[PDB]
Design a protein around this ligand. Structure first.
Ligand code: EHQ
Length: 121
């Protein structure tokens, strides 16, 4: 178990770019990590965004968030070929990064307090 609740991570989910997140406990399972139905480890994360979302993410698609400038190192893992950055998505990503940069300056307990989502049935 590489990550704990409140840890800042980048997550690569679906068609979206590497995205700033916080590890958190699933509101129903009450765990932040599990072994999936294919036998692989996953972590439960919250995406920093103006549109809050959560997901279970394979451990290979989760990375410690050390700072926003790490994005270039993540793009490297994959003439130089670069994907363009769609305007609306870029704007949402910049918002998420601003929150993650603020969270980086907080303690783990402060981050848990400030950002853990409230889930309503
Ligand atoms: C959208 C969306 N909805 O559910 C999930 C999961 C996502 C998602 N996947 N990868 C990144 C995001 C995300 C991007 C922007 N804001 C929040 C979440």
């Amino acid at each position: 178990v590489k990550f704990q609740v409140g840890d800042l991570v980048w997550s690569k989910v679906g068609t979206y770019p590497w995205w700033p997140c916080m590890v958190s406990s699933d509101p129903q399972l009450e765990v932040h990590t599990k072994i999936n139905t294919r036998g692989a480890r996953e972590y439960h994360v919250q995406f920093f965004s103006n549109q809050p979302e959560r997901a279970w993410v394979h451990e290979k698609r989760v990375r410690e968030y050390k700072g926003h400038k790490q994005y270039e190192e993540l793009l490297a893992e994959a003439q130089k070929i670069r994907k363009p950055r769609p305007q609306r998505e870029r704007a949402q990503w910049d918002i998420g990064i601003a929150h993650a940069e603020k969270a980086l300056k907080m303690t783990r307990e402060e981050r848990i307090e400030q950002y853990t989502f409230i889930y309503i049935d």
